[PDB]
Amino acid sequence: MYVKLISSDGHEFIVKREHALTSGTIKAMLSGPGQFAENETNEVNFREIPSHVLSKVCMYFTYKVRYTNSSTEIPEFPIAPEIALELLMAANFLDC
Amino acid sequence: VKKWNAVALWAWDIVVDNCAICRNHIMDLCIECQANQASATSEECTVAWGVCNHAFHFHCISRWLKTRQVCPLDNREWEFQ
Amino acid sequence: YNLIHLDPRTREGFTLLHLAVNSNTPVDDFHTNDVCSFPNALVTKLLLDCGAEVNAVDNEGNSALHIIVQYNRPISDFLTLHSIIISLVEAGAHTDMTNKQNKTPLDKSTTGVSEILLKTQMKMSLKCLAARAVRANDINYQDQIPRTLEEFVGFH
Amino acid sequence: NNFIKNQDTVIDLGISFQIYVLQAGAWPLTQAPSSTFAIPQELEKSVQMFELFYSQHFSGRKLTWLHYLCTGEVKMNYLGKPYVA
Amino acid sequence: TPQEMEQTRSAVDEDRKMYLQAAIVRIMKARKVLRHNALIQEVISQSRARFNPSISMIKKCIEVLIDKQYIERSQASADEYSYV
Amino acid sequence: DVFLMIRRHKTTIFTDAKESSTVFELKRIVEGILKRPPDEQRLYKDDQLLDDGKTLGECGFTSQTARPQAPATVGLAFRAFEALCIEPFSSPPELP
Ligand SMILES: [Zn+2]
Ligand SMILES: [Zn+2]
């Protein structure tokens, strides 16, 4: 039910499995060998992306689960200028 | 409740539903263009909007403003949008 | 299919999909006004089913979606507009790409009906938001991103 | 019926789904008074699942719910549930 | 319920008037001028496959189109109608 | 529908909670997803201990306060209750 994401800089992120299945690459990572079917952690070690981009993509996962199709006054997503051009690569790598 | 049935009346998400001049729907032609069949003016039928969220046919709004500059529903001055 | 896979273009970069999409496509004054009225959702559905490049852009940079949201008769033939927007989104056209003037199709919707329909059919993604924010912040993206994503920054 | 099966999460609404969908333009049936009947909470998750399904398959189509033609099966949990109603 | 039965008759009584209003407009657009009595025979001719219009129904519907500034009696004679 | 970002050292947990709900089941769900005994949890709201009886929506952060775009940064501490030592995420590289 809960999946674990580890950033390259040691930082861990835990979010709902439904929240992290909105990205195709993470869905592939959970599938396949080493699924670690303990149903509690399913940890994945992102060896490249830093901590802040992983925090931002977890925020995005929750943001898309909450507002997938509802509340047509959709809130804007606060991309910082410094975190941009690095979250784009992360989103591409995760196929969000 | 083990099982339940219902009916759902679906209609298009347009905020306006009827043109209260000819009392017709907006999807089909206005009475101005229903008279001379297809011809050439049937293709236009531009749905003019109003500042008071009042949407009617172009022909209906044209003849209405020819009569008076009052909204057909409320005593509001007509304006385009 | 044979005609699409040569990609014909008019003077203003209009691909063959765009002319079926556009309302400004000239129609002969004779009986062709009665039958072939553009835009026509049947033509767009057939062309996308025959493999038209739905992401193709003209000289001005407008996509098929950019042209179709600029339709000035959203309700007189609302079924046509709804069917063509559904077909365009289902084909894989980006609902977020930008023309040469850097305008969202929602920003170029110029109509409440088209805006509502496209927002209903917009399928948001993190990549789209990130690329749009990068373009708005005007960060130097060349030689710092994947080359396939360089195109993504190009149209988003 | 297969959409709830094709969902990424197993959503067991608990009510068999047989809801008709009918065009508002053609059918003469409608609702003149308010009759603002609130959805029962045991099936209020069903309509939200149906609104989720209907919006993506049929964009730009609101669904007013005419409850005066709407009927279901009775859960007599207070009666000890004899037979069905 | 017989109370709702009259409502259905009254509802189509609204529909028959709206069709007559469009029926008057259809003939008047193709002519822009006609005799008052000849139009009554014409609207009947175009409504045989549909609702049979009583004579009083055309009376009020023509009157309705008069105040909607679409039809008007001609200045030459009140028996001559004209698009406006 | 309030959103939380529970932090503890290098571990970050994203969780959605209701408007009026006590932190008792919040401690129980973080127990269930953290595989540690439930008696150690003591969450802090900006270096301040929070009342267990008080619902988290009334604890200081509301639905408008804790947007899903960037939820609250409610920390987490374990029994020796240890002092909070949450590691901040690495700053993004400065744009040229
Ligand atoms: Zn009208
Ligand atoms: Zn008005």
In the 3-class helix/strand/coil scheme, how is chain E assigned residue by residue? CHHHHHHHHHHHHHHHHHHHHHHHHHHHHHHCEEEHHHHHHHHHHCCCCCCCCCHHHHHHHHHHHHHCCCEEECCCCCCEEEEC
- State the pairing for strand pair B56-57/B47-48: antiparallel
C-alpha torsion E39→E44→E45→E47, nearest 10: 130
Q: Which residues surround ligand 2, an ion (CB under 5 A)?
A: B 52, 54, 71, 76
Residue D34 CA: distances (Å) to CA of D19, D28, E45: 22, 17, 42
Across the beta sheet with D16-17, what order do the strands follow?
D16-17, B3-5, D71-72
Residue B74 Cα, ligand 2 centroid: separation in angstroms? 6
Q: Cα–Cα distance between B60 and E70 in angstroms, integer?
A: 11
Residue F47's domain comprises: 1-96
Task: Identify the closest residue of chain D to B17 by CA–CA distance.
Answer: D25
Q: Which residues in chain D are closer than 8 Å to A69, comparing Cβ atoms?
A: 52, 55-56
Residue B56 Cα, ligand 1 centroid: separation in angstroms? 6
C-alpha torsion C141→C144→C149→C152, nearest 10: 0
Q: Cα–Cα distance between D4 and C131 in angstroms, integer?
A: 33
Q: Is B47 helix (H, G, I), strand (E, B) or coil?
A: strand
Q: Do chains F and A touch (3 or more CB pairs under 8 A)?
A: yes
Residue type, F59: C
* Number of neighbouring beta carbons within 10 Å of residue F61: 20
Q: How many helices (H) and strands (E) does chain F have?
A: 1, 2
Which among E45, C140, B8, E24 has a CA at the least distance from the CA of A81?
C140
Note whether D8 contacts A69, CB cutoff 8 Å: no
**C133 token code pair:** 């924010």
Contact C94, C55 (CB under 8 A): yes
Q: Cα–Cα distance between A45 and B45 in angstroms, integer?
A: 60
Q: Cα–Cα distance between B76 and B71 in angstroms, integer?
A: 5
Tell me if chain D has a CB within 8 Å of the CB of A12.
no
Measured in whole angstroms, the distance separating CA F43 from the mean position of its chain's CA atoms is 6
Which among E60, E75, E55 has a CA at the least distance from the CA of E17?
E60
Helical spans, DSSP H, in C5-155:
16-21, 32-35, 41-49, 64-69, 78-91, 112-121, 126-137, 147-155
Residues in chain B: 81
Helix (H) or strand (E) holding B11: strand B7-12
Residue type, F77: A
Residue with tokens 């001049």: B21
- Which bound ligand lies closest to the C-alpha atom of B55? 2
Strand-pair partners of B11: D62
Tell me if chain C has a CB within 8 Å of the CB of D61.
no
First to last CA, chain C: 28
**A25 token code pair:** 């690459």
> Best mutation site among B7, B14, B26 for testing chain D: the one with the most D CBs within 10 Å?
B7
> Best mutation site among C123, C126, C140 for testing chain A: the one with the most A CBs within 10 Å?
C126
Angstrom resolution of this structure: 3.9
Q: Cα–Cα distance between E5 and C136 in angstroms, integer?
A: 63
Contact A42, A35 (CB under 8 A): yes
What backbone phi and psi angles, to 5 degrees, belong to C108?
Answer: -100, 20
First to last CA, chain F: 39
Note whether A19 contacts F68, CB cutoff 8 Å: no
Q: Number of structural domains, chain F?
A: 1
Note whether A12 contacts F12, CB cutoff 8 Å: yes
**D71 token code pair:** 């009927």
Mind telling me how many Å the CA of A33 is from chain F's nearest CA?
A: 23
Which among B55, B25, D61 has a CA at the least distance from the CA of C83?
D61
Note whether C75 contacts B14, CB cutoff 8 Å: yes
Helical spans, DSSP H, in D18-78:
44-57
Note whether A2 contacts F35, CB cutoff 8 Å: no
**Which residues fall within 8 angstroms of residue C130, CB to CB, at 6 or more apart?**
A79, A84, A87, A88, A91
Mind telling me how many Å the CA of C89 is from chain D's nearest CA?
A: 11
Tell me if chain B has a CB within 8 Å of the CB of D71.
yes
The CATH code of the domain that includes F47 is: 3.10.20.90
Measured in whole angstroms, the distance separating CA A87 from the mean position of its chain's CA atoms is 11
Which among A2, A5, A91, A3 has a CA at the least distance from the CA of A51?
A5
Q: Cα–Cα distance between C122 and C107 in angstroms, integer?
A: 13
Q: Domain residues of chain A, as ranges?
A: 17-93
Mind telling me how many Å the CA of C145 is from chain A's nearest CA?
A: 7
Q: Which residues surround ligand 1, an ion (CB under 5 A)?
A: B 19, 21-22, 30, 57, 60
Residue D28 CA: distances (Å) to CA of D22, D31, E13, F40: 11, 10, 15, 65
Residue C95 CA: distances (Å) to CA of A68, C9, F6, F12: 16, 22, 35, 34
Residue type, C156: H
Mind telling me how many Å the CA of D25 is from chain B's nearest CA?
A: 7
Q: Cα–Cα distance between F7 and F91 in angstroms, integer?
A: 17
Residue with tokens 């109603």: D85
Q: Cα–Cα distance between B35 and E30 in angstroms, integer?
A: 8
Residue with tokens 């139009």: E39
Dihedral sign, CA of C72, C75, C78, C80?
A: negative
**F6 token code pair:** 């529970």
Q: Cα–Cα distance between C66 and B70 in angstroms, integer?
A: 36
Tell me if chain B has a CB within 8 Å of the CB of C102.
no
Residue B8 region, left (φ>0) first, then alpha (ψ -120 to 50), else beta? beta
**Which residues fall within 8 angstroms of residue B58, CB to CB, at 6 or more apart?**
B30, B44, B45, B46, B47, B48
Measured in whole angstroms, the distance separating CA B45 from the mean position of its chain's CA atoms is 10
Mind telling me how many Å the CA of E7 is from chain B's nearest CA?
A: 18
Q: Which residues in chain B are closer than 8 Å to D20, comparing Cβ atoms?
A: 5-8
Q: Cα–Cα distance between D27 and D6 in angstroms, integer?
A: 32
**D5 token code pair:** 């099966």
Provide the 8-state DSSP code for F44: B
Residue A39 CA: distances (Å) to CA of A36, C24, F5, F10, F36: 8, 57, 21, 21, 16
Measured in whole angstroms, the distance separating CA E11 from the mean position of its chain's CA atoms is 17
**C46 token code pair:** 């057939």
Task: Identify the closest residue of chain A to D8 by CA–CA distance.
Answer: A18
- State the pairing for strand pair D16-17/B3-5: parallel
Q: How was this structure determined?
A: cryo-EM
Q: Cα–Cα distance between A27 and A33 in angstroms, integer?
A: 12
Task: Identify the closest residue of chain D to A67 by CA–CA distance.
Answer: D52
* Number of neighbouring beta carbons within 10 Å of residue F47: 8
Q: What is the CATH number of domain A17-93?
A: 3.30.710.10
Nearest to D69 among B3, B7, B13 (CB): B7
Helical spans, DSSP H, in chain A:
17-20, 24-30, 51-66, 87-94
**Which residues fall within 8 angstroms of residue F13, CB to CB, at 6 or more apart?**
A13, A14, A15, F4, F5, F6, F7, F30, F33, F34, F76
- State the pairing for strand pair A44-45/E80-83: unpaired
* Number of neighbouring beta carbons within 10 Å of residue E54: 9
Residue C51 region, left (φ>0) first, then alpha (ψ -120 to 50), else beta? left
Across the beta sheet with B7-12, what order do the strands follow?
D20-23, B7-12, D61-65
Q: Would you call the peptide bond into F93 cis, given omega within 30 degrees of 0 as the criterion?
A: no
Q: Cα–Cα distance between C31 and F28 in angstroms, integer?
A: 74
Q: Cα–Cα distance between B50 and B48 in angstroms, integer?
A: 7
Provide the 8-state DSSP code for A54: H
Contact C124, C132 (CB under 8 A): no
> Best mutation site among D51, D56, D59 for testing chain C: the one with the most C CBs within 10 Å?
D59
Contact B74, B62 (CB under 8 A): no
- State the pairing for strand pair B47-48/F2-8: unpaired
Contact D22, B8 (CB under 8 A): yes
Q: Do chains B and E touch (3 or more CB pairs under 8 A)?
A: yes
Strand-pair partners of D64: B9
